[PDB]
């Protein structure tokens, strides 16, 4: 991903205020509610029958933390996302068979969650910079 220093600055500043205990769980939970076929990959997580059961599920929250941790790892290696995400790419493709279109959907749900948490602070320039990051992570995973 090619971000200008100002875009990298905007991304890093907003990422520093992210509640790492909730944002990941909210993005994963919203992926499961909005694109409901994604629940197939998480069948063992238990009750996913309603939006409230999904969002409040302890396994959804714990796994969402791991996902957010990986997006953060992408922020450290923007010029080599392919190499950084190599192991995860192998896991999601060869083992899990996740169609790569779902990686783009998860990145866009994460942008929505950031907008929902930050409101007016998630300005159009700040979103544009995050769009480069989430496209880079989804392409690296694919």
């Amino acid at each position: 991903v090619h971000l200008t220093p100002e875009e990298k600055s905007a991304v890093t500043a907003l990422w520093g205020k992210v509640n790492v205990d909730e944002v990941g769980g909210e993005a994963l939970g919203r992926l499961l509610v909005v694109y409901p076929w994604t629940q197939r990959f998480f069948e063992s997580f238990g009750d996913l029958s309603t939006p409230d059961a999904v969002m409040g599920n302890p396994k959804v929250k714990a796994h969402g933390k791991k996902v957010l941790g990986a997006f953060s790892d992408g922020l450290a290696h923007l010029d080599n996302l392919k190499g950084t995400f190599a192991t995860l790419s192998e896991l999601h493709c060869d083992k899990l068979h996740v169609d790569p279109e779902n990686f783009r959907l998860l990145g866009n749900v994460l942008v929505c969650v950031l907008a929902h948490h930050f409101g007016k602070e998630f300005t159009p320039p700040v979103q544009a910079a995050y769009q480069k990051v989430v496209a880079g992570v989804a392409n690296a995973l694919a």
Partner: protein
């Protein structure tokens, strides 16, 4: 295919937009042009600078069209036929661009109306904007 609950969710959330319709439509377009610059190639005749009056006026038309689509959610091919004529037959907009604008409308709604943007409402708005996008990109004349 929208469920009955999706329809009531979209009507309730879009009803909270009200007087801010143009403002939200303009912001969604601005977010689209800035995040996905290829979408600017559909508006070569526009002043695309930030705060452009042309972008503001266009945003009000987009928001008003969505208000009409919400009101006639069970008869959208008929209600939006001239918009399908423009987007599918004349402009021939690639359907990917509708996913981009729909995402930017969701982002704007999440930023401005956090109380309304519940996971259930986000899901219903996503399907609704996908159905509006299918109508505007299909040739059914």
């Amino acid at each position: 295919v929208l469920s009955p609950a999706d329809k009531t969710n979209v009507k309730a959330a879009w009803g909270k937009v009200g007087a801010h319709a143009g403002e939200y439509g303009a912001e969604a377009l601005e977010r689209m042009f800035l995040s996905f610059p290829t979408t600017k190639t559909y508006f070569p005749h526009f002043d695309l600078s930030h705060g452009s009056a042309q972008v503001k006026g266009h945003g009000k038309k987009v928001a008003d069209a969505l208000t009409n689509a919400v009101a006639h959610v069970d008869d959208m091919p008929n209600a939006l036929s001239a918009l399908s004529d423009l987007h599918a037959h004349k402009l021939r907009v690639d359907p990917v661009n509708f996913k981009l604008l729909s995402h930017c409308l969701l982002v704007t709604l999440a930023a401005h109306l956090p109380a309304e943007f519940t996971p259930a409402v986000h899901a219903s708005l996503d399907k609704f904007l996908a159905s509006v996008s299918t109508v505007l990109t299909s040739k059914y004349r």
